[PDB]
Amino acid sequence: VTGLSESMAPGDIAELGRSAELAFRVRFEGALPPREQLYWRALTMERFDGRRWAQAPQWSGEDALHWQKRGPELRYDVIMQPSSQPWLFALDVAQTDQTDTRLMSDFHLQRRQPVEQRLFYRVSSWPQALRESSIDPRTRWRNLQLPMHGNPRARALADELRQAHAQPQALVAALLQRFNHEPFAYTLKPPATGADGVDDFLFDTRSGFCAHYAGAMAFVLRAAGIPARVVAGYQGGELNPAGNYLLVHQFDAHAWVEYWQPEQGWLSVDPTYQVAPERIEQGLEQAL
Ligand SMILES: [Cl-]
């Protein structure tokens, strides 16, 4: 069963980029949101071992210290194909009618068992929800984790950025600007990197797919003292006007970033948008 799994190395999402299998279908109560908003969260990956980003264990996120509803509620129904994984796909921050599924501490939906048959479920999402304005110290610590060894160039960059930009939002903007101005390539056939994979990507090849960009950005943020994690899921979808629903295929698999700061809580950012805005605005198969 092709699909997202609990870990990924840069390159692994590109392999899904090459699959046209169906992942899920979605029908909205009202108008389809703009494509730029169609970030379908599956899970977060908080552990980086120098090669792969991976899911950590979670606890409950269904409480008011965790998050606060604000802004518009988007209501939609989903039919998911079997994933053989226990994650329901939904726009952040999601609530469902599934009594065996819980919103976890990292704002992903964890089902008690993996989805091994087609599954219909109903969702409400609050994309403007405030997330963890006060962060659990364990969550903070976990999201500053890096290997001690490896990727010295990226650590040097993070140091330089931290010294130049006191405010997290400014540092994040400066990092996004590097992707925007430098000759980065967005490709389904990224060049191989060596052991210092983040350095090789940022400073040598400047070529990758979404996991390269998301993983490298999360690395640099953590090295600069900004808690950050990779978000994995899907972005976009294909409209079926005969049936009035969106299809989301495996080629729509995507990875992005969220980072934390006091008061504002977690904010999501997508470095891919700096290099391949058409991917976001048009969809991968209209771009690549
Ligand atoms: Cl990838």
Swiss-Prot record:
Q: Does the keyword Cell membrane apply?
A: yes
Q: What induces it?
A: Is expressed in both exponential and stationary phases of growth. Appears to be part of an operon together with PA2874 and PA2875.
Q: Which UniProt keywords apply?
A: Acyltransferase, Cell inner membrane, Cell membrane, Membrane, Transferase, Transmembrane, Transmembrane helix
The protein's GO terms of the molecular function aspect are:
protein-glutamine gamma-glutamyltransferase activity
Q: What results from gene inactivation?
A: Disruption experiments show that tgpA is essential.
The record's Gene Ontology cellular component field reads:
plasma membrane
UniProt lists the family membership as follows: Belongs to the transglutaminase-like superfamily.
Anything else known:
Unlike Guinea pig TGase, TGase activity is not affected by EDTA addition, suggesting that TGase activity is Ca(2+)-independent, similar to members of the bacterial transglutaminase family.
Task of the protein: Displays transglutaminase activity (TGase) in vitro. Plays a critical role in the viability of P.aeruginosa. Might contribute to an essential function linked to the cell wall.
Free-text note on domains in this protein's UniProt record: The transglutaminase activity is contained within the periplasmic domain (180-544).
The protein's name is Protein-glutamine gamma-glutamyltransferase
Record organism: Pseudomonas aeruginosa (strain ATCC 15692 / DSM 22644 / CIP 104116 / JCM 14847 / LMG 12228 / 1C / PRS 101 / PAO1)
Lineage, highest ranks first: Bacteria, Pseudomonadati, Pseudomonadota, Gammaproteobacteria, Pseudomonadales
Which residues of the entire protein appear here: the answer is 195 to 482 of 668
